[PDB]
């Protein structure tokens, strides 16, 4: 019924093995005269409503570095947007939420190695990043082939 | 070395060298654009100079 049998040893030797790249884009938006988004590693204290993933793979500038293995739901771009502060200045020792998280997580079903990170400026002069992820896909039961 | 010294040594190397690979492509492209502009203006005198300059700059390997 249109199936086929493949040699496992040929697959081990590199038959029909391929390479997969996926790129992610993000940029800093401008909402007003001094309301800008920032690429940064958000902290559990100064930001609220964080993603359930892990932020420990981000660098100081909020961007992951190439060569780092990533898994699903990991944060590859760290971005925060400002929020008007609440009355928490009552008795909070500077530990009050002023920013909201807008980070970009890796897709839940995908994982791989960070291949190349690009940082530049858009037409408007704001920061603009692109992250490319690389993985290898080996043939297995269910993959589609054709003559 | 300090940051200022590094910048100065960069300016020394850049003012010394007549060439940087990528930027030679940009100059030749700009010269070609200027040449087509001169051609569209029927300026038979400027175009000769631009052609000579392009011939001198070119001949890559």
């Amino acid at each position: 019924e249109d199936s086929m049998i493949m040699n496992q040893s040929s697959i081990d030797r590199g038959l029909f093995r391929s390479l997969f790249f996926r790129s992610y884009m993000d940029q800093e938006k401008r909402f007003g005269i001094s309301i800008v988004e920032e690429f940064e590693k958000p902290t559990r204290a100064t930001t609220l409503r964080l993603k359930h993933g892990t932020y420990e793979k981000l660098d100081e500038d909020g961007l992951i570095a190439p060569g780092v293995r990533v898994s699903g739901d990991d944060i590859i771009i760290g971005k925060t947007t400002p929020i008007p502060p609440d009355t928490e200045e009552l008795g909070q020792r500077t530990k009050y939420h002023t920013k909201r998280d807008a980070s970009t997580p890796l897709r839940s079903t995908e994982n791989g190695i960070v291949d190349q990170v690009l940082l530049t400026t858009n037409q408007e002069g704001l920061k603009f990043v692109k992250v490319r992820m690389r993985t290898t896909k080996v043939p297995q039961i269910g993959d589609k082939f054709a003559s | 070395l300090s940051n200022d010294e590094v910048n100065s040594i960069v300016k020394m190397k850049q003012s010394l060298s007549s060439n940087t690979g990528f930027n030679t492509v940009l100059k030749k492209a700009q010269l070609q654009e200027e040449l087509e502009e001169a051609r569209d203006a029927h300026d038979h005198e400027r175009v000769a100079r631009i052609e000579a300059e392009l011939k001198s700059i070119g001949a890559e390997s």
Binding site: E1, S3, Q140, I141, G142, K144 | -
Partner: protein
């Protein structure tokens, strides 16, 4: 298209990422293995499990 396109099977957990069928049931489903996909629905009650095992098997 017809009521034989939904039938209740018994689960067998296996490695790799594809549903596996005995080839005799590929006729009522009008299915072959060139890329077709099929849907699986899990009953969530004793009553529904009994209905599936006694009616749609």
């Amino acid at each position: 298209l017809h009521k034989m396109s939904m039938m209740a099977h018994r689960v067998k957990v296996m490695p790799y990422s594809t549903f596996r069928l005995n080839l005799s049931v590929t006729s009522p489903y009008n299915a072959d293995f060139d890329g077709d996909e099929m849907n699986l629905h899990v009953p969530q009650s004793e009553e529904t499990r009994a209905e599936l095992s006694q009616l749609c098997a």
